[PDB]
């Protein structure tokens, strides 16, 4: 249940989480600004939550795929947020790679190295 919920939150409609369908060019742009701010401040939080979930459930393949999911342009995550959040995401990815390599499995891709 929680995996399906987090997957739906990540791959919600209109690309990333909370994406404005119509621009507020004729009303109040403050709503769109607040939506963008909340998205850029909450997407790393959901990423860390899913990283911890996959760490506890042994899903290093999904942990590695989360990097590509974040880098995808559908989530509108072009590294324009907090450097502290970037460092925390990098530390989580390094921990995932270390936990995957501890079981004699290289983190290159999803299986053994080429």
């Amino acid at each position: 249940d929680v995996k399906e919920k987090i997957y739906n939150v990540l791959l919600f409609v209109d690309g990333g989480w909370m994406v404005d369908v119509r621009e507020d060019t004729e009303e109040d742009p403050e709503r769109s600004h607040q939506m963008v701010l909340l998205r850029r401040l909450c997407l790393p939080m959901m990423c860390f939550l899913l990283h911890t979930v996959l760490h506890n459930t042994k899903q290093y393949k999904d942990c590695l795929r989360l990097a590509d999911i974040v880098s995808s342009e559908n989530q509108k995550l072009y590294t324009v947020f907090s450097k502290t959040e970037m460092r925390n995401l990098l530390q989580k990815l390094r921990e995932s790679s270390l936990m995957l390599l501890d079981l004699q499995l290289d983190p290159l891709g999803y299986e053994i190295q080429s």
Binding site: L64, R65, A67, D68, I69, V70, S71, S72, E73, L77, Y78, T79, M86, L90, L93, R94, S97, L98, L101, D102, Q104, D106, P107, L108, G109, Y110, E111, Q113, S114
Partner: protein
Amino acid sequence: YNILEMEYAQKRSELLSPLLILGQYAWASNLAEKYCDFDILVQICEMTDNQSRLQRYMTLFAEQNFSDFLFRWYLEKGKRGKLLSQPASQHGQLAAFLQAHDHLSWLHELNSQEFEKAHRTLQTLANMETRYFCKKKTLLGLSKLAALASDFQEDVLQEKVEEIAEQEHFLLHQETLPKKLLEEKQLDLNAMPVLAPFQLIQLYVCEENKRANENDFMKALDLLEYIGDDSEVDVEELKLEILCKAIKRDEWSATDGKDDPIEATKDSIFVKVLQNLLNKGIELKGYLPKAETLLQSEELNSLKTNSYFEFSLKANYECYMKMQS
């Protein structure tokens, strides 16, 4: 003198045998620390569960670069976990050692904030990857993340993002395969190698595909421009085969049998493909065979029913070429 020192080291190695057979790793290390040696100490500290000995050896012989041998022994003995979990203090030595092993070099650079080197390594890996489409797309996503987190110029980062987006759109041709056809061919997603554009064109041409819309023709036309397998192969024959298959899959050459040479051709697939190409902007006379070639081809005599079909197709093609040129 070199031969003398070589045979002397060989005699030392031959003498060092009963102590290693019996045991006493601490005594062996205390005996070997009197001479200038590093590999034996590294191996005797790695094969045991005593980290304080390795720590004091490192603090004593840090002037002799006590890091390369440790990295080599961690990589050879399968201790890549400890190699990656090593503390942050020997990043330069780790990079100089892993410069030949990219599968760990990219992760080490990402950890050491060498975003440019990590992105370059990931791009090289994605370019050298020949099989495993899932691994290729994973490396492409990792390279996209590294380029987005890189410290290069804004224009260079935008160009890299556009290139990775074009690569993702090229992989979308294989991603947009019907699950029914995938299950019939027995391969499943995330388990197929990097399919060639010619292979994708053959799959769209064969009857095993569960689709018959203009999306397959558009994907084939895009793969014709994309690189992969159509380099040495001439694109003229591929375009001719695509046009022949589009004529064969029409809903008038073998489906309908009326006598009106107007709507019968418009209710097909060829007219829709021509209209899509005209709306996109591709030339219908240079990127596609000519009307003379289509008439001289032997497929018309086997795919025709009356002269109305051929005349209407020729007239529509000529009018489209005239309005495009």
